[PDB]
XYZ file of C-alpha atoms in Angstrom:
755
model
C -71.466 -148.845 -27.067
C -69.050 -151.616 -26.038
C -66.891 -153.532 -28.520
C -69.567 -156.232 -28.520
C -72.206 -153.852 -29.861
C -69.706 -152.497 -32.371
C -69.072 -156.084 -33.523
C -72.803 -156.590 -34.001
C -73.020 -153.299 -35.906
C -70.139 -154.161 -38.216
C -71.671 -157.555 -38.936
C -75.035 -156.154 -39.971
C -73.285 -153.500 -42.077
C -71.108 -156.055 -43.844
C -74.106 -158.318 -44.397
C -75.761 -155.381 -46.154
C -72.669 -154.955 -48.338
C -73.007 -158.555 -49.499
C -76.742 -158.119 -50.142
C -76.008 -154.980 -52.173
C -73.476 -156.666 -54.459
C -74.597 -156.437 -58.071
C -72.438 -155.727 -61.114
C -69.821 -154.049 -58.966
C -69.043 -151.019 -56.847
C -66.218 -148.754 -57.942
C -65.220 -145.141 -58.464
C -65.685 -142.968 -61.566
C -62.955 -142.913 -64.205
C -62.494 -139.319 -65.307
C -60.494 -140.622 -68.272
C -63.155 -143.061 -69.512
C -65.933 -140.616 -68.783
C -64.126 -138.088 -70.950
C -64.168 -140.600 -73.817
C -67.855 -141.389 -73.439
C -68.509 -137.613 -73.379
C -66.980 -137.353 -76.841
C -69.697 -139.332 -78.606
C -71.779 -136.802 -80.639
C -75.601 -136.875 -80.424
C -76.989 -139.699 -82.556
C -79.675 -137.413 -84.007
C -76.952 -135.398 -85.759
C -77.521 -132.437 -83.454
C -74.589 -130.393 -82.132
C -74.535 -131.855 -78.628
C -72.813 -134.688 -76.798
C -74.897 -137.860 -76.985
C -74.516 -138.132 -73.189
C -74.734 -134.489 -71.934
C -74.568 -135.667 -68.327
C -71.003 -136.944 -68.775
C -69.827 -133.567 -70.061
C -71.407 -131.946 -67.022
C -69.714 -134.550 -64.813
C -66.346 -133.454 -66.183
C -67.165 -129.798 -65.522
C -68.134 -130.573 -61.921
C -65.316 -132.953 -60.944
C -62.038 -131.193 -61.610
C -59.692 -131.158 -58.590
C -58.225 -128.103 -56.815
C -54.845 -128.341 -58.535
C -56.557 -128.358 -61.934
C -56.187 -132.057 -62.622
C -58.825 -134.767 -63.009
C -58.521 -138.278 -61.610
C -58.890 -140.026 -58.285
C -58.397 -137.500 -55.494
C -58.230 -140.198 -52.817
C -54.893 -141.425 -54.183
C -52.375 -139.432 -56.184
C -50.665 -141.133 -59.115
C -48.927 -138.832 -61.576
C -49.697 -140.992 -64.631
C -53.372 -141.206 -63.637
C -53.733 -137.417 -63.280
C -52.008 -136.407 -66.528
C -53.903 -139.131 -68.410
C -57.281 -137.983 -67.121
C -56.494 -134.265 -67.454
C -55.356 -134.563 -71.055
C -58.449 -136.639 -71.869
C -60.813 -134.124 -70.226
C -59.149 -131.070 -71.794
C -59.535 -132.572 -75.252
C -63.231 -133.362 -74.677
C -64.156 -129.959 -73.241
C -62.254 -128.312 -76.100
C -64.208 -130.411 -78.612
C -67.474 -129.238 -77.074
C -66.254 -125.642 -76.865
C -67.145 -125.626 -73.190
C -65.601 -125.170 -69.741
C -63.011 -122.600 -70.858
C -61.746 -121.997 -67.336
C -61.472 -125.694 -66.437
C -59.555 -126.314 -69.649
C -57.125 -123.537 -68.730
C -56.596 -124.851 -65.178
C -56.137 -128.329 -66.637
C -53.535 -127.086 -69.095
C -51.586 -125.474 -66.266
C -51.716 -128.615 -64.148
C -50.655 -130.767 -67.081
C -47.729 -128.435 -67.776
C -46.558 -128.353 -64.162
C -46.965 -132.100 -63.734
C -45.416 -132.900 -67.128
C -42.140 -131.351 -65.985
C -41.897 -133.508 -62.841
C -42.433 -136.930 -64.427
C -38.799 -137.829 -63.783
C -39.408 -138.188 -60.039
C -42.370 -140.533 -60.479
C -40.348 -143.045 -62.515
C -40.509 -145.667 -59.744
C -44.314 -145.518 -59.760
C -46.296 -148.119 -61.713
C -47.493 -147.336 -65.242
C -51.301 -147.647 -65.684
C -52.584 -150.358 -68.049
C -52.015 -149.302 -71.647
C -50.537 -145.925 -70.691
C -47.850 -145.937 -73.375
C -50.472 -146.701 -76.003
C -53.253 -144.382 -74.912
C -51.358 -141.348 -73.590
C -49.275 -140.529 -76.690
C -52.272 -141.091 -78.951
C -54.030 -138.193 -77.211
C -50.827 -136.111 -77.231
C -51.047 -136.235 -81.030
C -54.742 -135.299 -80.945
C -53.972 -132.342 -78.693
C -51.226 -131.157 -81.036
C -53.606 -131.258 -84.025
C -56.116 -129.212 -81.995
C -53.385 -126.716 -81.194
C -53.399 -127.137 -77.411
C -50.488 -125.361 -75.704
C -48.536 -128.212 -74.129
C -44.800 -128.788 -73.414
C -44.502 -131.173 -76.370
C -40.750 -130.583 -76.451
C -40.233 -131.961 -72.958
C -38.089 -135.105 -73.260
C -40.713 -137.186 -71.443
C -43.542 -136.195 -73.790
C -41.493 -136.156 -76.978
C -39.953 -139.550 -76.223
C -43.123 -141.332 -75.151
C -44.658 -140.537 -78.547
C -41.614 -141.951 -80.330
C -41.729 -145.089 -78.181
C -45.431 -145.619 -78.875
C -44.724 -145.441 -82.594
C -41.997 -148.078 -82.252
C -44.471 -150.186 -80.276
C -47.319 -150.051 -82.787
C -45.168 -151.189 -85.723
C -44.104 -154.040 -83.454
C -47.587 -155.437 -82.728
C -48.369 -158.947 -84.099
C -51.405 -158.417 -86.343
C -52.261 -162.131 -86.195
C -52.679 -162.267 -82.435
C -54.391 -158.880 -82.427
C -57.207 -160.154 -84.667
C -57.320 -163.911 -84.000
C -58.832 -163.821 -80.504
C -59.889 -161.159 -77.998
C -56.804 -159.981 -76.096
C -56.022 -157.263 -73.567
C -54.939 -155.050 -76.485
C -58.675 -154.480 -77.044
C -58.766 -152.906 -73.581
C -57.164 -149.819 -75.100
C -58.448 -149.521 -78.670
C -58.905 -145.777 -78.163
C -55.134 -145.591 -78.585
C -54.889 -147.829 -81.666
C -57.496 -146.096 -83.840
C -54.966 -145.280 -86.563
C -53.638 -148.806 -87.101
C -56.586 -151.142 -86.639
C -58.844 -152.930 -89.185
C -62.260 -152.153 -87.702
C -64.040 -154.994 -89.483
C -61.734 -157.637 -88.013
C -62.043 -155.956 -84.612
C -65.866 -156.202 -84.614
C -65.636 -160.009 -84.500
C -63.927 -159.772 -81.125
C -66.701 -157.729 -79.495
C -67.954 -158.919 -76.077
C -71.369 -160.500 -75.534
C -72.529 -157.330 -73.752
C -71.199 -155.246 -76.630
C -68.081 -153.991 -74.875
C -64.505 -154.337 -75.995
C -62.739 -156.077 -73.108
C -65.060 -154.277 -70.677
C -63.458 -150.880 -71.336
C -65.890 -147.925 -71.726
C -63.370 -145.634 -73.439
C -62.374 -148.456 -75.775
C -66.016 -149.163 -76.580
C -66.738 -145.453 -77.050
C -63.900 -145.158 -79.554
C -65.099 -148.218 -81.478
C -68.627 -146.787 -81.577
C -67.444 -143.463 -82.930
C -65.534 -145.295 -85.688
C -68.195 -147.848 -86.718
C -71.558 -146.749 -85.336
C -71.937 -150.299 -83.994
C -75.094 -150.319 -81.850
C -74.134 -153.005 -79.327
C -71.316 -150.663 -78.270
C -74.030 -148.143 -77.414
C -76.018 -150.776 -75.507
C -72.953 -151.420 -73.321
C -72.488 -147.731 -72.581
C -76.188 -147.310 -71.764
C -75.846 -150.363 -69.499
C -72.872 -148.845 -67.681
C -74.653 -145.495 -67.357
C -77.720 -147.292 -66.024
C -75.585 -148.184 -63.006
C -73.585 -144.952 -62.620
C -75.920 -142.317 -64.057
C -73.531 -139.569 -65.201
C -70.103 -141.237 -65.398
C -68.330 -144.550 -66.039
C -65.518 -146.685 -64.487
C -62.441 -147.927 -66.402
C -63.977 -151.405 -66.806
C -67.336 -153.013 -66.106
C -68.981 -155.086 -64.967
C -66.990 -156.467 -62.013
C -69.413 -159.013 -60.538
C -67.122 -162.062 -60.341
C -64.079 -160.122 -59.231
C -66.045 -158.338 -56.488
C -67.770 -161.428 -55.079
C -64.690 -163.677 -55.052
C -62.423 -161.072 -53.473
C -64.975 -160.065 -50.828
C -65.392 -163.707 -49.804
C -61.655 -164.384 -49.806
C -61.131 -161.227 -47.751
C -63.523 -162.184 -44.947
C -62.194 -165.755 -44.943
C -58.516 -164.697 -44.776
C -59.330 -162.185 -42.021
C -60.993 -165.009 -40.078
C -64.469 -163.460 -39.755
C -66.302 -165.540 -42.366
C -68.308 -167.566 -39.814
C -70.488 -164.483 -39.372
C -71.645 -164.472 -43.015
C -72.294 -168.039 -44.105
C -75.601 -167.187 -45.809
C -74.087 -164.223 -47.658
C -71.017 -166.137 -48.809
C -73.414 -168.844 -49.994
C -75.479 -166.405 -52.048
C -72.345 -164.845 -53.563
C -70.684 -168.144 -54.504
C -73.885 -169.578 -56.038
C -73.859 -166.528 -58.309
C -70.228 -166.983 -59.316
C -70.711 -170.699 -59.928
C -73.766 -170.074 -62.150
C -71.284 -168.163 -64.296
C -68.488 -170.727 -64.072
C -66.897 -171.694 -67.380
C -64.677 -174.736 -67.921
C -62.124 -172.581 -69.755
C -61.813 -170.288 -66.759
C -63.473 -167.016 -65.878
C -62.711 -163.345 -66.129
C -63.647 -160.525 -63.788
C -67.106 -160.123 -65.316
C -69.833 -162.616 -66.180
C -69.274 -164.007 -69.684
C -66.012 -162.070 -70.037
C -64.452 -162.118 -73.549
C -61.264 -163.580 -72.058
C -60.624 -165.369 -68.754
C -57.707 -164.527 -66.478
C -55.656 -166.770 -64.212
C -56.236 -164.545 -61.164
C -60.056 -164.702 -61.151
C -59.940 -168.336 -62.291
C -57.476 -169.405 -59.608
C -59.447 -167.547 -56.911
C -62.717 -169.065 -58.045
C -61.235 -172.550 -58.397
C -59.935 -172.630 -54.804
C -62.904 -171.000 -53.076
C -65.590 -172.818 -55.094
C -63.745 -176.074 -54.517
C -63.443 -175.563 -50.774
C -67.147 -174.746 -50.600
C -68.274 -177.979 -52.273
C -68.887 -176.823 -55.845
C -68.094 -179.112 -58.776
C -65.240 -177.257 -60.399
C -62.266 -178.774 -62.201
C -58.607 -177.817 -62.130
C -58.749 -178.193 -65.930
C -59.624 -174.478 -65.961
C -55.937 -173.724 -65.352
C -54.861 -175.460 -68.577
C -55.967 -172.313 -70.407
C -53.045 -170.418 -68.840
C -50.258 -172.981 -69.219
C -47.684 -172.615 -72.021
C -45.928 -175.481 -73.824
C -43.176 -175.327 -71.186
C -45.150 -175.433 -67.957
C -45.070 -171.718 -67.142
C -48.334 -170.024 -66.208
C -49.364 -166.522 -67.239
C -52.361 -164.284 -66.476
C -53.740 -164.488 -70.027
C -53.753 -167.100 -72.779
C -51.136 -166.270 -75.402
C -49.302 -163.622 -73.363
C -46.206 -163.437 -71.145
C -47.785 -161.089 -68.619
C -48.045 -162.014 -64.926
C -47.248 -160.508 -61.536
C -46.664 -161.230 -57.855
C -50.308 -160.750 -56.950
C -51.693 -163.221 -59.497
C -48.927 -165.832 -59.146
C -49.670 -165.649 -55.431
C -53.368 -166.473 -55.786
C -52.412 -169.216 -58.230
C -49.968 -170.592 -55.636
C -52.594 -170.682 -52.880
C -54.885 -172.515 -55.301
C -52.277 -175.101 -56.390
C -52.000 -176.520 -52.874
C -55.660 -177.549 -52.645
C -55.226 -180.380 -55.104
C -56.549 -183.902 -55.485
C -54.570 -186.973 -56.528
C -53.763 -187.027 -60.221
C -54.136 -183.304 -60.875
C -50.818 -182.832 -62.679
C -51.703 -179.250 -63.659
C -51.916 -178.202 -59.985
C -48.451 -179.642 -59.336
C -47.058 -177.702 -62.302
C -48.807 -174.540 -61.057
C -47.274 -175.059 -57.628
C -43.765 -175.389 -59.091
C -43.994 -172.401 -61.468
C -45.494 -170.071 -58.872
C -42.955 -171.105 -56.239
C -39.967 -170.343 -58.461
C -41.546 -167.068 -59.518
C -42.584 -165.879 -56.046
C -39.183 -166.713 -54.551
C -37.358 -164.931 -57.337
C -39.677 -161.967 -56.722
C -38.966 -161.675 -52.982
C -35.433 -160.713 -54.008
C -36.537 -157.587 -55.868
C -39.627 -156.608 -53.857
C -39.525 -154.727 -50.552
C -41.900 -154.919 -47.588
C -44.461 -152.112 -47.433
C -43.078 -150.714 -50.722
C -44.336 -147.132 -50.920
C -44.977 -147.506 -54.657
C -47.038 -150.710 -54.527
C -50.834 -150.589 -54.514
C -51.005 -153.450 -51.970
C -50.126 -152.603 -48.352
C -47.585 -155.443 -48.030
C -47.619 -158.110 -50.712
C -44.208 -159.331 -49.540
C -45.739 -160.263 -46.209
C -48.495 -162.215 -47.947
C -45.959 -163.984 -50.118
C -43.595 -164.823 -47.266
C -46.506 -166.295 -45.308
C -47.920 -168.253 -48.248
C -44.523 -169.745 -49.067
C -43.510 -170.695 -45.536
C -46.991 -171.673 -44.310
C -48.787 -173.311 -47.296
C -52.228 -174.937 -47.170
C -51.243 -178.034 -45.182
C -49.350 -175.953 -42.599
C -51.637 -172.956 -42.260
C -53.864 -172.934 -39.159
C -56.891 -170.546 -39.257
C -55.857 -168.286 -36.358
C -52.262 -167.956 -37.563
C -53.350 -167.141 -41.130
C -55.987 -164.758 -39.817
C -53.407 -162.962 -37.687
C -51.032 -162.720 -40.619
C -53.585 -161.190 -42.960
C -54.937 -158.882 -40.256
C -51.476 -157.289 -40.269
C -50.902 -157.317 -44.044
C -54.409 -156.282 -45.118
C -54.625 -152.779 -46.594
C -58.112 -151.300 -45.859
C -57.472 -148.361 -48.155
C -55.518 -149.971 -50.980
C -56.335 -148.750 -54.477
C -56.086 -150.705 -57.721
C -54.367 -150.026 -61.027
C -56.153 -150.462 -64.343
C -56.406 -148.101 -67.308
C -56.681 -145.644 -64.398
C -56.488 -145.798 -60.610
C -59.701 -147.320 -59.272
C -61.168 -148.342 -55.922
C -63.176 -151.364 -54.839
C -65.220 -150.359 -51.712
C -66.325 -153.957 -51.129
C -62.842 -155.488 -51.178
C -60.754 -152.710 -49.580
C -62.697 -151.471 -46.571
C -61.927 -150.297 -43.030
C -64.923 -152.235 -41.692
C -63.596 -155.698 -42.560
C -60.337 -154.949 -40.742
C -62.041 -153.288 -37.790
C -64.212 -156.364 -37.311
C -61.279 -158.754 -37.831
C -59.323 -157.109 -35.012
C -62.217 -156.839 -32.564
C -63.241 -160.437 -33.247
C -59.703 -161.802 -33.046
C -59.050 -160.199 -29.659
C -62.482 -161.167 -28.313
C -61.726 -164.788 -29.214
C -58.144 -164.714 -27.913
C -59.441 -163.276 -24.633
C -61.829 -166.198 -24.166
C -58.932 -168.557 -24.998
C -56.693 -167.072 -22.285
C -59.396 -167.858 -19.737
C -59.823 -171.451 -20.926
C -56.055 -171.893 -20.793
C -56.037 -170.883 -17.134
C -58.712 -173.415 -16.280
C -56.662 -176.138 -17.983
C -53.543 -175.205 -16.070
C -55.482 -175.549 -12.814
C -56.742 -178.963 -13.911
C -53.150 -180.054 -14.426
C -52.111 -178.937 -10.934
C -55.232 -180.355 -9.269
C -54.563 -183.760 -10.852
C -51.164 -183.839 -9.203
C -49.590 -184.688 -12.545
C -46.792 -182.457 -11.313
C -45.597 -185.692 -9.697
C -45.045 -187.550 -12.978
C -41.324 -187.426 -13.728
C -41.401 -189.335 -17.016
C -43.194 -186.593 -18.924
C -42.641 -182.849 -19.349
C -45.645 -180.628 -18.577
C -46.890 -178.608 -21.576
C -50.584 -177.704 -21.328
C -50.066 -174.390 -23.153
C -48.270 -175.973 -26.088
C -51.032 -178.592 -26.283
C -53.920 -176.152 -25.826
C -52.552 -174.113 -28.724
C -53.468 -176.855 -31.181
C -57.258 -176.914 -30.984
C -57.286 -173.204 -30.155
C -55.608 -172.514 -33.483
C -58.357 -174.166 -35.567
C -61.623 -174.722 -33.629
C -61.470 -171.309 -32.003
C -65.169 -170.353 -31.875
C -66.539 -169.606 -28.358
C -69.154 -172.337 -28.929
C -66.491 -175.060 -29.001
C -64.943 -174.341 -25.594
C -65.838 -177.810 -24.280
C -64.439 -179.554 -27.357
C -61.217 -177.575 -26.880
C -60.984 -178.649 -23.236
C -61.535 -182.334 -23.936
C -59.209 -182.155 -26.948
C -56.480 -180.715 -24.744
C -56.900 -183.205 -21.895
C -57.097 -186.158 -24.259
C -54.018 -185.019 -26.211
C -52.060 -184.483 -22.999
C -52.975 -188.005 -21.952
C -51.783 -189.471 -25.250
C -48.444 -187.763 -24.533
C -48.262 -188.999 -20.933
C -49.213 -192.581 -21.814
C -46.909 -192.468 -24.826
C -43.997 -191.744 -22.481
C -45.256 -194.337 -19.999
C -45.436 -197.165 -22.557
C -42.154 -196.018 -24.084
C -40.460 -195.688 -20.688
C -38.834 -199.034 -21.510
C -39.993 -200.262 -18.115
C -41.594 -203.689 -17.829
C -44.265 -205.021 -20.182
C -45.858 -206.887 -17.287
C -46.430 -203.524 -15.589
C -47.873 -201.891 -18.720
C -50.295 -204.801 -18.865
C -51.786 -203.670 -15.546
C -52.597 -200.285 -17.071
C -54.130 -201.843 -20.190
C -56.111 -204.277 -18.029
C -57.253 -201.501 -15.694
C -58.706 -199.623 -18.657
C -60.463 -202.784 -19.857
C -62.292 -203.598 -16.608
C -62.419 -199.877 -15.731
C -61.936 -200.016 -11.941
C -59.200 -199.622 -9.324
C -58.666 -203.331 -8.642
C -55.060 -203.282 -9.896
C -53.796 -199.945 -8.574
C -52.057 -201.767 -5.706
C -49.948 -203.845 -8.114
C -48.773 -200.688 -9.891
C -45.401 -198.917 -9.735
C -45.417 -195.542 -7.967
C -45.580 -193.372 -11.089
C -47.981 -195.630 -13.012
C -50.519 -195.637 -10.158
C -50.705 -191.857 -10.115
C -50.910 -191.717 -13.901
C -53.837 -194.140 -13.980
C -55.821 -192.619 -11.091
C -55.594 -189.321 -12.949
C -56.555 -191.039 -16.213
C -59.562 -192.692 -14.524
C -60.734 -189.526 -12.754
C -60.386 -187.418 -15.887
C -62.312 -189.777 -18.130
C -65.116 -190.607 -15.710
C -65.658 -186.848 -15.885
C -65.520 -186.708 -19.700
C -67.746 -189.802 -19.740
C -70.380 -188.133 -17.555
C -70.483 -184.896 -19.550
C -70.364 -186.959 -22.724
C -73.318 -189.073 -21.635
C -75.336 -185.906 -21.048
C -74.486 -184.374 -24.438
C -75.037 -187.633 -26.333
C -78.202 -188.918 -24.696
C -76.618 -192.308 -23.994
C -73.723 -193.857 -22.075
C -70.364 -193.216 -23.726
C -68.045 -195.067 -21.360
C -67.958 -198.164 -23.550
C -67.115 -195.943 -26.521
C -64.327 -194.168 -24.646
C -62.947 -197.508 -23.439
C -62.867 -198.966 -26.944
C -61.179 -195.848 -28.330
C -58.462 -196.278 -25.691
C -58.398 -200.077 -26.053
C -57.056 -199.773 -29.603
C -54.698 -196.943 -28.653
C -53.087 -198.853 -25.780
C -52.827 -201.934 -27.974
C -50.895 -199.839 -30.501
C -48.564 -198.574 -27.735
C -48.181 -202.152 -26.549
C -47.050 -203.432 -29.947
C -44.337 -200.753 -30.161
C -43.173 -201.528 -26.623
C -42.896 -205.255 -27.355
C -41.013 -204.563 -30.572
C -38.796 -202.184 -28.611
C -37.834 -204.548 -25.789
C -37.207 -207.259 -28.399
C -35.473 -204.657 -30.565
C -37.526 -205.726 -33.563
C -37.679 -203.697 -36.749
C -40.804 -204.679 -38.709
C -41.299 -204.030 -42.409
C -42.581 -200.628 -43.519
C -46.197 -201.723 -44.105
C -46.459 -203.495 -40.776
C -44.830 -200.615 -38.917
C -46.873 -197.878 -40.558
C -50.156 -199.703 -39.906
C -49.517 -199.749 -36.130
C -47.642 -196.417 -36.052
C -50.499 -194.629 -37.851
C -52.465 -195.430 -34.705
C -49.761 -195.102 -32.037
C -49.284 -191.472 -33.115
C -52.632 -191.073 -31.280
C -54.323 -188.431 -33.446
C -57.277 -190.745 -34.005
C -57.914 -191.039 -30.239
C -57.939 -187.271 -29.740
C -60.480 -186.890 -32.547
C -62.811 -189.714 -31.547
C -63.149 -188.470 -27.983
C -63.392 -184.763 -28.917
C -66.115 -185.592 -31.503
C -68.528 -186.239 -28.616
C -68.437 -182.568 -27.635
C -69.231 -180.571 -30.788
C -72.691 -179.486 -29.671
C -74.649 -182.013 -31.719
C -75.455 -185.661 -31.063
C -72.890 -187.896 -32.779
C -74.992 -190.394 -34.726
C -73.714 -193.837 -35.732
C -73.794 -192.772 -39.376
C -71.627 -189.694 -38.771
C -69.268 -191.726 -36.569
C -68.782 -194.422 -39.226
C -67.436 -191.634 -41.453
C -64.626 -190.692 -39.056
C -63.968 -193.837 -37.017
C -60.899 -196.062 -37.097
C -62.305 -197.955 -40.097
C -62.640 -194.824 -42.262
C -60.052 -193.880 -44.888
C -60.387 -190.269 -43.701
C -59.183 -190.858 -40.133
C -56.587 -193.378 -41.346
C -54.980 -190.828 -43.668
C -54.860 -188.256 -40.870
C -53.013 -190.722 -38.692
C -50.734 -191.740 -41.554
C -49.674 -188.200 -42.451
C -49.147 -187.299 -38.798
C -46.967 -190.333 -38.222
C -44.794 -189.741 -41.286
C -44.128 -186.036 -40.762
C -43.268 -186.805 -37.138
C -40.912 -189.636 -38.177
C -39.046 -187.910 -41.013
C -38.171 -185.275 -38.416
C -37.614 -186.891 -35.004
C -35.983 -190.025 -36.432
C -32.981 -187.682 -36.537
C -32.197 -187.806 -32.805
C -34.198 -190.863 -31.720
C -32.129 -192.964 -34.142
C -29.415 -192.470 -31.535
C -31.624 -192.343 -28.447
C -32.466 -196.009 -28.933
C -35.608 -196.991 -30.861
C -34.490 -198.475 -34.172
C -37.999 -198.871 -35.589
C -39.342 -195.932 -37.589
C -40.766 -194.991 -40.964
C -37.317 -194.318 -42.461
C -35.475 -197.083 -40.587
C -38.071 -199.648 -41.647
C -38.179 -198.553 -45.271
C -34.431 -198.918 -45.364
C -34.745 -202.456 -44.009
C -37.154 -203.386 -46.794
C -34.730 -201.943 -49.339
C -31.089 -202.254 -48.183
C -30.255 -201.691 -51.850
C -31.339 -198.048 -51.385
C -29.643 -194.793 -50.387
C -30.562 -193.185 -47.057
C -31.451 -189.877 -48.708
C -33.501 -191.743 -51.335
C -35.531 -193.179 -48.448
C -36.257 -190.012 -46.472
C -37.373 -188.553 -49.787
C -39.573 -191.547 -50.597
C -41.287 -191.136 -47.221
C -41.898 -187.457 -48.061
C -43.461 -188.673 -51.291
C -45.848 -191.071 -49.530
C -46.785 -188.343 -47.041
C -47.478 -185.922 -49.871
C -49.701 -188.282 -51.852
C -51.500 -188.999 -48.580
C -52.011 -185.283 -47.929
C -53.346 -184.943 -51.454
C -55.780 -187.797 -50.845
C -56.663 -186.182 -47.502
C -57.632 -182.978 -49.334
C -60.120 -184.852 -51.480
C -61.613 -186.485 -48.404
C -61.842 -183.179 -46.531
C -63.535 -181.578 -49.507
C -65.714 -184.288 -51.047
C -66.898 -186.409 -48.108
C -70.474 -185.627 -47.060
C -69.743 -185.150 -43.357
C -70.776 -182.341 -40.994
C -68.217 -179.516 -41.270
C -67.071 -179.583 -37.636
C -65.968 -183.230 -37.852
C -64.052 -182.604 -41.092
C -62.211 -179.753 -39.359
C -61.358 -181.964 -36.371
C -59.873 -184.566 -38.673
C -58.164 -182.311 -41.241
C -56.922 -179.630 -38.830
C -55.411 -182.220 -36.521
C -53.300 -183.445 -39.478
C -52.320 -179.832 -40.243
C -51.215 -179.146 -36.682
C -48.706 -181.984 -37.115
C -47.513 -180.672 -40.473
C -46.858 -177.367 -38.664
C -45.150 -178.698 -35.539
C -42.896 -181.032 -37.518
C -42.483 -178.975 -40.676
C -39.271 -179.006 -42.696
C -37.171 -176.293 -41.078
C -33.841 -175.342 -42.624
C -34.488 -172.673 -33.402
C -37.018 -175.508 -33.658
C -38.833 -174.963 -30.349
C -38.371 -171.219 -30.868
C -40.824 -171.485 -33.762
C -43.490 -173.095 -31.578
C -42.911 -170.385 -28.966
C -43.710 -167.818 -31.684
C -46.943 -169.554 -32.736
C -48.169 -169.794 -29.158
C -47.507 -166.096 -28.678
C -49.316 -165.077 -31.901
C -52.397 -167.144 -31.177
C -52.861 -166.866 -27.424
C -50.984 -163.877 -26.004
C -50.056 -161.009 -28.332
C -53.330 -159.328 -29.387
C -53.779 -157.721 -32.812
C -53.827 -153.921 -33.073
């Protein structure tokens, strides 16, 4: 069974996972199950109302005497679950031996809590754990109550309860409701009932709902427990359902790992579901959740937006405070690296005028950067394999600078296939953290990279066979150029588009140097004229170097024209000539301005420079080789007259200029974005200019997002336009050497395989 069969296997297995998604897949919560097991039979009989949960407890104690998730050891988790189970078995006068083994484990573990201090405290631990300690004491259980840890956590809980703001606690549903089982002595049940969830739960917590039921007999509470038990039979998780959380994270996982193309139909079915549950105030982890959270809302906002759904960034307003800081829940100060990170990724995919997204970007940036000072890579205590790596990548390579292969490689190395999650207890999400996603991501990434190494070879032979080794006015760089399309339109099906993209880009570089060689304009005119009549009637009047350049140009494009005519069902030479006609004209205007040392105004310069940068040319010629006939209607949406292509050219030109103007300002050319802006405003500071140009670029990138997302154009053409702009943002990104960075990208995408 070769790696190709394995790939097929993994794909069908992962497709089944998506088809199986319902209310959520997770592990049992011994702690919550213990609480459900406490509910006495409704008929007044002396039996648990859910006998199966008591039996579950009896059958699932671990070898060391504790209860909890065996897969991953967390001290807090084990002592929490053990105490909870011991109390429940004691109440039912059953499992005498298990209770004894549990007591012993609890006692041994209770005395070692000082070496687990660096571990993370489970949600509501300090509220729920001491509350049971007091129960245990009343029942006379033999526990090391005098141990500092246990004696002091009870005292701290007491000082925490008397410090809770009654108003907030009863005004709206809050995460405090997630642990009502630990607030049973200080809560006004009647006021609490008004904050019940639509499905009858209290913030989706089974133990919390069980406690409320035992105190009020409220029937909807029972309906929620029956509903949870309908799914799990004889036990419950620490929160349910998890339908929105599971679907959004599964989709984000396969996209970030770069294997999403294999599940378009599944991702479609999952997102339709999430959207049918979309709420303008934001969403939670479960359909119709009592309270939304910034993490699920930010995830959903970005992914639903990128997939064409009509969602608004207004959903984030729910998490913004009067000062512009964002938190995970309305009315709370809680937030963490993981959620600020997903919020940060989301804030970059904004449209013009979305002030909230800009504020989210600023807040998350300051918070993530301040966090990378106190967080270590691969921290042995964190539940994520390497959040620091995800942060570092997200901050250095944001949306507009992140190419698919590079992001996929990054996540492939930071993704933890066996990460656990921390809630009221330690829980696992089989459809988010799975060895199969990662296995497929690696096999697929190397299979693709292998195909790319072949293509690269065949491009390097084209360069040598064209004798371009003769050209002395331009530095050879097929690899560097091939990296670009390879980084975004990587699929094996687009090999031809990659080839033509590479050759066309290389020619825009060669001709760019030719027209900027400061030679004679009369000579350049022969090249332009040759392209117009498309023959070799002027090759004899051409300088040595130019002649070679053109012959190569002519031979290469007659080839592309032929293959293009066959894939388009019509002659494409006229099309190719017109594409180049405008490109050469743009080069010609710069050359004339150069020889005359003219510095046009900003507007005039940018209009020509947006074209001279040549990104449009690369796109228009590559668009003939996608695999589908390019109709006149599709073309009109990406041609030189479209706002979409114009913005791509504009952003490419500006990023290139804000950077290179540095050295070229002394190399000669005095006409550039910055230089020209300064000429239109001599009453302006140099720095103020560079910055202004960064502002224009940014608004343009923001407008480009909206085009990329909202324009009804076949996906492949939107990628060709949008990714080409990104490649420029990456190559000319704000640094802080330079060419060393490129070297690294080339290595990560084309040579070093993932293991």
